[PDB]
Amino acid sequence: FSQRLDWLHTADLGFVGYHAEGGYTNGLIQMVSQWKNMAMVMARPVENPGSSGIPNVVYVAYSQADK
Amino acid sequence: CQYKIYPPLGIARVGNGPAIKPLSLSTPEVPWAHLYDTNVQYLVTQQELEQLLEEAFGGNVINEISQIKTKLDKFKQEEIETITGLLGLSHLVPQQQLSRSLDNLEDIVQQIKGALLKVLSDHYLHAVKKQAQNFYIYKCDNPVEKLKLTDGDKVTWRVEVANKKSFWYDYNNALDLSLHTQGSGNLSKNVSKHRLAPAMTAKRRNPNVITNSLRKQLVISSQGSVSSDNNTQVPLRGKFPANERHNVLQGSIECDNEGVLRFYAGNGISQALSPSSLNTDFADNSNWFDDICDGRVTAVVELKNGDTFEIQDEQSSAWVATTPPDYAPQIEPIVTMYDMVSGAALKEQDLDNLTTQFSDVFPILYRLYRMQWVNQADFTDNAVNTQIRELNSELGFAQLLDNSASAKSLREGIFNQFRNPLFDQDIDVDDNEWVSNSRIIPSKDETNIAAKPATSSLKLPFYPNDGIDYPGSPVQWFAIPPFMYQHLQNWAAGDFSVTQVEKESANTIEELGLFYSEQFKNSPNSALLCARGALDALYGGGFHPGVELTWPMRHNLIYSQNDYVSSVTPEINLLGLREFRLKQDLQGLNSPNMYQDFGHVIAVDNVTASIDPNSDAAWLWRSTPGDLTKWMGIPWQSAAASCQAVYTPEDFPIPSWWAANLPVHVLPLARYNKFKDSQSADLPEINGMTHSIAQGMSEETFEHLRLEQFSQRLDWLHTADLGFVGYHAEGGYTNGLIQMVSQWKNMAMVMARPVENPGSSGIPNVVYVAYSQADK
Ligand SMILES: [Mg+2]
């Protein structure tokens, strides 16, 4: 529950691959095509959290690279 | 063996001009035929567009345009696309723009023939005309006589092409540089033997596509057939990725009533699958495709009586390859692809048995001399070209045709300025490593440690070469190949012959040039002339990778046949005429080796294995469609933009790669218009000056201004906007590669133009002027 991912890493914004440059400017350029693949946050249930400390309603980011 | 195709290796060049005869060019079928033709038009002119349009208005058309004049007494969908077609022109411009051209209207013939001339000129005005190859069927006994069709007869041509650039390996350098050999006419054994420019391993292009099955998608392919009984043009259209997805016009084919095949290349369109995928490398850019092609040309001759002759063997069939445009068609490379064919069949160790006529050496001097129109070093910094000018000054050029001792010192003094392709001069040996003591071409990655001062002069020509990657290698710089160097040494020593009629036309280099030109024009073997003419405009070095083709061409193993047959004329060799043919996979596009490779890398080890024809690798030399061009840069525009100058710390001379076909320094139109007029002209503007100013100055001064203008040469890369235009424009190498994809079609085109009265200015009667929209 505690592992949070950079939203800019939810799709390929220029940082993927051996020696990908990544960086600010490649993110601007790649977003033109990749905006439609960025993660989409949506409320989802945890039906029996028990004593874990996870709330019954979580907000989860959905993308394809995201799993 | 009864019928054969010529040329054996046809060449077609891409252009955005249309694929029609009046507005296209033809690959040379005779060497040197038009070197001084001052009426050439290698870009589509307004005149050609008007005469094209007038013909389409012949002549029914006005009849039936006045048969429409009455029933308007705007247009409308139905009378739009009836006028449309009639004028046969949607094969030139999309029907829609043709229609919204007239949809938008308000002598009726003229505003039709006027609104449509505006759409034609926007599409094609100043367009790079395509250079198409004519293929001919010849009869044999050995060719003599074209084919002549009788009524009941028919020829059917077939063509299969492919582009495998995106499928193939990175181009780092020529792999044959480390291949063990006894030496050929094109490459000395010293290069490999002494490791002067080691061949480098090369990884795959588009490496993220894995498995041979999926990599087949990286190969673009197409095929078509045309006959003598129908001159309708057939497109050669493939798709990328192969069978999202873009259509790629690889070429167009046509057959006329007489049985001659005309091959047009593509429109020069290169593109990446994503706009953000930029082509920043000179050769290896993944995610890109271009419309370059090469393939297999076959035919079937079917007669009246039903006797069918099939031309599909390798000794009788032909090949075709498309290439970038020639931006200076009348300026020949110093060493051509034909020269590599000629040298491929020769052994280095047997060059002492070669025999030389002066016509064998003249082309080197003549070509190097005419390099002055495309390269500054050869205009201002080439001691041999200046000495030739001195000879012409005195009508004394014939002295170089003198084989006697009286002329030895003169012939030697020139011969000795030329680089030796043994690559064993101007070196000091470490320990063994051969290190040049002449001027090196440094890498861009600098080391702030003082250079070792050169002790030997820089030899000719001043061009980089296949070993440019290695500072201090003698192979960083280009040498004419061993067999032509042999010709030049024989000439220097006096072991050469020449006829008296040649001496009598040799007062200047130009006088002897047109004599040798007429020899070609009156040579009787049109078949072999057409085979040579197809390759004589192509470069034959250096290969990094080159412009049109690359290093596999310099090896005899790529040819199934390569034999000398004849002098150009009985007494005048002029480097000879040869019968040559490529090794071909008779299955073509359906060959099991159409998609062969060597795994994760290619290396010289693979080429070594490919020598043995029994090997798993011998397929390398048995070309399937796409095999000749796959080595070249993808897209070709980045390679061309990289095929320019390579600057040294020393300013002069400026090294240039392949300036005969991709010029480096040109004479713009704008300068031509400032020196073509004589002071006598009766114009309000004379050479860019008012009538009053031009005629008020002394004649001395007028002529000096003419030659000052003539001497202003422009960087070819500055003839269109390649990223250097505008306030705080970055310019630079990489923006050139990127912008050439769109700007190749606006680059200046060099063409011969006249100077009616040069007077005493020093300007020649024939100049070669670079035309572009920027420089006008
Ligand atoms: Mg040229």
Contacts of B448 (CB under 8 A, 6+ apart): none
CA atoms within 13 A on the CB side of B418: 27
How many inter-chain contacts (A to B, CB under 8 Å) are there? 6
Give me the long-range contacts of B522-527 (CB less than 8 A, separation at least 24): B522/B569, B523/B30, B523/B568, B523/B569, B523/B577, B525/B143, B525/B565, B525/B566, B525/B577, B526/B29, B526/B146, B527/B4, B527/B6, B527/B136, B527/B138, B527/B143, B527/B144
Distance from A30 to chain B by nearest Cα, in Å?
7
* B422 residue type, one letter: L
3 state DSSP class of B560? strand
Smallest CA–CA distance, residue B208 to chain A, in Å, is 10
Helix (H, G, I), strand (E, B) or coil at B365: helix
What is the residue whose two structure tokens read 């350098």?
A: B173
φ, ψ (nearest 5 deg) of residue B155: -110, 140
Phi, psi of B754 (to 5 degrees): -90, 155
Which one-letter amino acid corresponds to residue B150? T
Q: How far apart are CA B257 and CA B180, in angstroms?
A: 50
User: Which residue do the tokens 């004028």 mark?
Assistant: B87
Give the amino acid at B615: S
Ligand 1 centroid–CA B546 distance in Å is 13
**Closest listed residue to residue B7, CA positions, set B200, B136, B106:** B136
Distance of CA B268 to the CA centre of its chain: 14
Give Dmax over CA atoms of chain A in angstroms.
45
The DSSP output letter for B544 is: S
- Torsion angle, alpha carbons of B142, B143, B149, B150, to 10: -50
For residues B375 and B478, the answer to whether their CB atoms sit within 8 Å is no
- CA angle (B253 as vertex; B133, B537 as ends), nearest 5: 15
The rounded distance, in Å, linking the Cα atoms of B366 and B513 is 8
DSSP letter assigned to residue B431: -
- B689 to chain A, minimum CA–CA distance in Å? 50
**In 10 A of CB B575, how many CB atoms?**
24
> What CA–CA distance (Å, rounded) separates B652 from B533?
34
- CA B666, distance to chain mean position in Å, is 17
* CA distance, residue A53 to nearest chain B CA (Å): 43
Q: How far is A59 from chain B (nearest CA, A)?
A: 33
Q: Which of B634, B606, B639 is nearest to B168 (CA)?
A: B634
Give the contacts of B489 (CB within 8 A, at least 6 positions apart): B415
Q: Closest residue of A to B274, CA-based?
A: A33
Question: How is B577-596 classified by DSSP, letter by letter?
Answer: EEEEEE-B-TTGGG-TTTT-
Q: Which residues surround ligand 1, an ion (CB under 5 A)?
A: B 326, 328, 331, 660-661
Alpha carbon of B539 to ligand 1 centroid (Å) = 8
| Owner of token pair 């480096």 | B664
Q: How remote is the CA of residue B659 from the centroid of ligand 1, in Å?
A: 8
Q: For residue B721, count other CB atoms closer than 10 A to its CB.
A: 16
Distance, CA of B758 to CA of B755 (rounded, Å): 6
Q: Which residues of B participate in the annotated binding site for Mg(2+)?
A: 326, 328, 331, 660-661
| Residue B50 CA, ligand 1 centroid: distance in Å | 29
Hey, is B246 helix, strand or coil?
strand
Rounded Cα distance, B447 and B445, in Å? 7
Minimal-distance CA residue of chain B relative to A32 = B276
Task: Check: CB of residue B292 under 8 Å from CB of residue B322.
Answer: yes
- H/E stretch holding B154 reads strand B154-163
Give the residues across from B261 on adjacent strands.
Answer: B135, B255
Burial class (CB in 10 A: 0-12, 13-18, 19+), B450: exposed
CA distances from B390 to B394, B396, B563, B577 (A): 7, 8, 39, 33
Structure tokens at B224: 């078509």
- B2 and B140 Cβ atoms separated by less than 8 Å: yes
Checking phi first, is residue B450 left (phi over 0); if not, alpha (psi -120 to 50) or beta?
A: beta
Cis peptide before B653 (omega within 30 of 0): yes
Experimental method: X-ray
Longest distance between any two alpha carbons in chain B, whole Å: 96
With beta carbons less than 8 A apart as the criterion, state whether B485 and B343 touch.
Answer: no
* Residue at B240: amino acid letter: F
Nearest to B347, CA basis, from B481, B447, B162, B198: B481
Note the helical H segments in chain A: 23-34
On chain A, the residues whose CB falls within 8 A of the CB of B276 are: 29-30, 32-33
Residue A48 tokens read as: 């029996």
Query: Do B157 and B261 contact (CB within 8 A), yes or no?
Result: yes
Name the residue of chain B whose CA is nearest to A17's CA: B208
Q: List the structure tokens of B468.
A: 């440019």
For residue B763, the CA-to-ligand 1 centroid distance in Å is 22
Per the listing, tokens 């990289």 go with: B642
Q: Rounded to whole angstroms, what are the CA distances from B159 to B255, B302, B561? A: 12, 17, 21
CB A61 within 8 A of CB A43: no
C-beta of residue B65 within 8 angstroms of C-beta of residue B112: yes
Q: Are strands B9-13 and B318-323 parallel, antiparallel or unpaired?
A: parallel
Instruction: Find the DSSP H helices in B546-643.
Output: 604-611, 636-642
Residues on chain A touching B208 (C-beta within 8 angstroms): 17
Please tell me the distance from the alpha carbon of residue B554 to that of residue B548, in angstroms, as a whole number.
Answer: 13
**Resolution stated for this PDB structure, in Å:** 2.2
Instruction: Compute the C-alpha angle B493/B495/B500, nearest 5°.
Output: 120
Q: Write down the residue that tokens 């009508």 correspond to.
A: B395
- Give the length of chain B: 776
Residue B365: CA count within 13 A, CB half-sphere = 29
Report the residue of B276, B278, B280, B600 to disrupt the A interface, i.e. the one with the largest count of A CBs within 10 Å: B276
Cβ atoms within 10 A of the Cβ of B104, count?
10
* Contact between chains at A32 and B276 (C-beta distance less than 8 A): yes
Residue located via tokens 């429409």: B68
Q: Residue B120 and residue B55: Cα distance in Å, rounded?
A: 14
Q: Chain B residues with CB inside 8 Å of A32's CB?
A: 276
Residues of chain B contacting A33 with CB distance shorter than 8 Å = 274, 276
Q: How far does the centroid of ligand 1 lie from the alpha carbon of residue B409, in Å?
A: 32
Task: State residue B518 phi and psi, 5-degree precision.
Answer: -65, -30
Strand partners, B253: B234, B263
Residues in chain A: 67
Tell me which chain B residue has its CA closest to the CA of residue A26. B276
Please list the residues that pair with B5 across neighbouring strands.
B137
Residue written as tokens 């705007």? B74
Which residues of chain B have a CB within 8 Å of the CB of A29?
276
Written as one string, the DSSP assignment of B17-48 is S-SSSTT-EE--SSTTTTTT-TT---B--HHH
Cα B129 to ligand 1 centroid, rounded to whole Å: 15
Phi/psi of residue B503, each to 5°? -55, -35
